[PDB]
Amino acid sequence: PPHGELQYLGQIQHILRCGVRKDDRTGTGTLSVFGMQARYSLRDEFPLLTTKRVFWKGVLEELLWFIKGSTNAKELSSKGVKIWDANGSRDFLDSLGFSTREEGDLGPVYGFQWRHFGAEYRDMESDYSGQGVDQLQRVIDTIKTNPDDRRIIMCAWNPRDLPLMALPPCHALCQFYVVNSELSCQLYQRSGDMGLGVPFNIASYALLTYMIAHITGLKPGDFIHTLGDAHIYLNHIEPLKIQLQREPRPFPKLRILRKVEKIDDFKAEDFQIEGYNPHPTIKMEM
Amino acid sequence: HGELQYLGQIQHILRCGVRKDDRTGTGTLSVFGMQARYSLRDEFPLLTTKRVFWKGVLEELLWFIKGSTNAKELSSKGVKIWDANGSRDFLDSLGFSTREEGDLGPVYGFQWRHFGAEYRDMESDYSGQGVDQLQRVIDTIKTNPDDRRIIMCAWNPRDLPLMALPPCHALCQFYVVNSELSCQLYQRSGDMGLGVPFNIASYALLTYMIAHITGLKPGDFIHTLGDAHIYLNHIEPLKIQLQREPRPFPKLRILRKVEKIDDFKAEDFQIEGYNPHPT
Ligand SMILES: Cc1nc(=O)c2cc(CN(C)c3ccc(C(=O)N[C@@H](CCC(=O)O)C(=O)O)s3)ccc2[nH]1
Ligand SMILES: Cc1nc(=O)c2cc(CN(C)c3ccc(C(=O)N[C@@H](CCC(=O)O)C(=O)O)s3)ccc2[nH]1
Ligand SMILES: O=c1ccn([C@H]2C[C@H](O)[C@@H](COP(=O)(O)O)O2)c(=O)[nH]1
Ligand SMILES: O=c1ccn([C@H]2C[C@H](O)[C@@H](COP(=O)(O)O)O2)c(=O)[nH]1
Description:
The structure is a homodimer.
Chain A (H helix, E strand, L loop, with lengths): L4 H14 L1 E3 L7 E12 L14 H13 L4 H6 L6 H4 L1 H6 L14 H7 L18 H11 L7 E3 L15 E9 L2 E12 L3 H20 L2 E15 L3 H8 L8 E4 L14 E4 L12
Parallel strand pairs in A: 5-6
Antiparallel strand pairs in A: 1-2, 2-6, 3-4, 4-5, 7-8
Helix pairs in contact in A: 2-6, 2-8
Bound molecules: tomudex (2 copies) and 2'-deoxyuridine 5'-monophosphate (2 copies).
The site of one 2'-deoxyuridine 5'-monophosphate has 9 residues of chain A, from strand 5 and helix 8.
GO cellular component, one term (chain B): cytoplasm
Subunit structure (chain B): Homodimer.
Organism (chain B): Homo sapiens (Human)
């Protein structure tokens, strides 16, 4: 049966052959296609792309940071993961008119929404215990008590809070689904940079699904990745063409090294990637 | 023929689907994660292999646009599709003893126009309260079409407990390139036999409406599904439907120049050449 990574690579080829020129904020331009979908089996494999190295450490720490409900980019940065620092910098915050906001304060993004949806956001260091809806926990409780449910959804898109965010969410929502003891996940990603973010994003939700499957006593199933604006930035075309030349190697496995009862208890040390043999990384700027 | 995609999806669920129970005890064949693409360029995707309830599509959309959450209002127009969820029994079953009959809570209309406002009842005044997502979409398409955030979201976790039915159409996104407006819908759960063809037509129509307001040509409608399923008692009738060769899609004519989305009326629309098979 074919390698799941051929779907992602298929999507790249499709955007190069059938994409349309489309401008963006940064003046760079993109080749863009609207509406794509790919399916990655999580059964005895983990979809961490091999044709280009994916920043695993960042995937893991960013997810743990989301789970804590943090929106402090400095916290994530302290762990050697710089992926949200440009958006939290004094410069970028001032350019959105957040002059009085502290450096690193990204607003009411992922962490805040997953745990405190609809609560009144003050600042990144504030107390929010019991405020808003804890979507992550509600998902977990529903999978345990009523797996056939077709409403197991986490949503980070909050129109009321948009004006306050440093970068409005790309993963607008995700849905879970359970059949024959297999947990699957679909992600609606409104906008996807195929060169940089998308492989990282695939790994984030693949990992989330492994985490929740473990908590709930289920086997990981599929991860479905659905895209809105799927695009390649023009200065990424050359490095992506190089990537298309490479034959994928087999996916690695993800081992979880102990029994964890609650999602808040997962630590980075609990996870181990086994057999990840990626080709040498190509720089893709942003 | 774009309808071959929908029919393709039916066949895929029959051949590859899995037996799965649901709220109603009926059981389903189910697949998680599907996507289909329907060209809106000089055609309108109203399915021909089984008749779609056009009048209901149109009136339901106009009702969403007004911001209405009153099932009795929709019902008054001969469209009974939300009546069971607005009935007194059902309302009491969810612990809404003091809510009036027809009041579905903060559903579609409310969210599209007043997202995050404090919902009191269906007849209340909400002028200027919350976020008007529909208008913001329209204003963004006009001023900054390249934007990748043109989104309308009906999924509001804070308001879920108050709704009679949680939304199927969690969100939709718009996209503009070369003067063509496209729409993608994330539908968490889709009954391929009944709702899905109706739902395809609703968002296809929305896209035609907004394209008209913004001066753009309709492009694609992308339909993305979470739990795509057929109920077990629909298998035999759907197999009959798969036998029928689809006929070309009809056209949608808009019969006057309308400047604002709130001004569209049912009389403004005309389906031209719709030749569906007998149900
Ligand atoms: C155009 C663009 N703008 C962004 O702000 C953006 C942000 C993210 C947020 N995010 C989730 C990530 C940002 C950066 C990642 C990353 O993998 N950084 C590695 C670089 C590895 C590489 O160059 O291939 C790193 O920190 O070194 S992952 C992802 C894609 C984006 N793409
Ligand atoms: C199993 C299921 N339960 C529901 O409650 C349900 C509700 C909707 C809400 N909705 C959006 C609609 C409800 C009814 C429609 C309809 O078009 N009825 C037609 C066709 C009748 C038929 O083919 O048997 C009609 O009454 O004329 S459209 C859609 C699918 C559902 N599917
Ligand atoms: O996790 C993420 C975060 C951001 N992006 C991308 C997509 C776009 O290229 C850009 C987002 O900016 P807007 O779409 O909001 O303009 O960064 C991703 O692909 N994945
Ligand atoms: O516009 C709609 C509304 C409802 N349904 C369906 C799918 C399910 O069969 C049922 C909803 O059940 P839940 O997923 O809410 O449990 O009605 C649709 O297909 N389209």
